[PDB]
């Protein structure tokens, strides 16, 4: 697998676009590019990123688009409890589309640079530990853990 399809899912305003932009460009503020060549664990690989945008809706095409993805990032905001609440929702949707219980997935806690938090790290770790998926706190603004989140998702795909 020299090529990887990655889909970023999450609530509106959690920073999915900012995470993708801070991966490709890579700076913090764009549909210019969604593709990057990087080296992970001594092996080069190409990454295609689907930055899911807009309200959730029924769509046969969107299902096909997500089904193309091999790995999924579940992003929530630490200052948004409601975004963390919807994590179970995005997970079930992914399992529904991929038609599998074991889908390569990584739980992402974004905006960890903000001093005011509503969801603690432990509460998020316990959720990811029950799913059997890794959990990484990221910050698109300070470019903290951005690469770590996507690269770990690549590891998850390689293990499966």
């Amino acid at each position: 697998m020299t090529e990887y399809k990655l889909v970023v899912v999450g609530a509106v305003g959690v920073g999915k676009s900012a995470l993708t932009i801070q991966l490709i460009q890579n700076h913090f503020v764009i549909e210019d590019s969604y593709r990057k060549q990087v080296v992970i664990d001594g092996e080069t690989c190409l990454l295609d990123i689907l930055d899911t945008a807009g309200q959730e809706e029924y769509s046969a095409m969107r299902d096909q688009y997500m089904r193309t993805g091999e790995g999924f990032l579940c992003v929530f905001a630490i200052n948004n409890t409601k975004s963390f609440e919807d994590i179970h929702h995005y997970r079930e949707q992914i399992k529904r589309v991929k038609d599998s219980e074991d889908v390569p997935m990584v739980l992402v806690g974004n905006k960890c640079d903000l001093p005011s938090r509503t969801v603690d790290t432990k509460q998020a770790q316990d959720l990811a530990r029950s799913y059997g998926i890794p959990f990484i706190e990221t910050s698109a603004k300070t470019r903290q853990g951005v690469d770590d989140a996507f690269y770990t998702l690549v590891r998850e795909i390689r293990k499966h």
């Binding site: 549909e31 590019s33 969604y34 295609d48 990123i49 689907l50 945008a53 769509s59 688009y65 193309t68």
Partner: peptide, 30 residues
């Protein structure tokens, strides 16, 4: 905001780059 066609002279890499942008565009216009 629809991505321009890669063209006939486009290489495989150019097609991959286009496909990724088309991937996000098609999802968004649904």
């Amino acid at each position: 905001r629809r991505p321009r066609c890669p063209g006939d002279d486009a290489s495989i890499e150019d097609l991959h780059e286009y496909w990724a942008r088309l991937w996000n565009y098609l999802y968004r216009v649904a």
